[PDB]
């Protein structure tokens, strides 16, 4: 669960 970043706070989570 890294920080979201470009993905946004609403975006999907990685890895």
């Amino acid at each position, epitope marked *: 669960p890294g920080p*979201p970043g*470009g*993905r*946004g*706070l*609403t*975006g*999907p*989570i990685g890895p």
Partner: antibody
Amino acid sequence: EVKLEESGGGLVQPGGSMKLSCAASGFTFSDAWMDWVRQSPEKGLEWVAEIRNKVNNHATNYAESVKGRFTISRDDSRSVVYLQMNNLKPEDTGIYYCTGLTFDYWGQGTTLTVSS
Amino acid sequence: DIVLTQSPASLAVSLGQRATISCRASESVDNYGISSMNWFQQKAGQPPKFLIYAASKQGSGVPARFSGSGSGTDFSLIIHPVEEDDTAVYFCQQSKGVPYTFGGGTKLEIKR
């Protein structure tokens, strides 16, 4: 201050084409995941397309109902996202919003009308 | 597709009272210990504005009276104390899987 402005909407005949543009500022654009979302009274809010950042290979994805007809792209040097729409249908009518950081930020929207 | 079903469709709440809006997902939106459920407010003539993320976390500069709860398939947005400016349609939205999907919206009417 974040700012998204979309343009290029209007009227087009069924089967025709239209290209929407989204100008963005106030965040690192090359890192941002950008999307298009549309709204209509019939279908509500529909996610249309995604384009990921350079680190994620500008990977695109689309709603099943627009696959093969819509193409999302971006110019990282100008901070613009594009949505090329081909073989438009009356059900594609609606307000098209450009969004940044997935859905953190939204433009005011541009209206597409598909009618003869 | 993960289908989000909101209830109620609309709601009339007095000033200073609680508004409770539900969202049910057709399957789990849990994802690495975080429920990917966001909430948006759409005021008249405007785009949706992002309020809550990851079920319960507050968007930047979003007033304390908006809070979100839930996990798995059942979520809610609670607005308390309700004010005049909270008249709007509220949408839930899911980022667990592509395609990203929104609920149908719930209309909050302020009683007077």
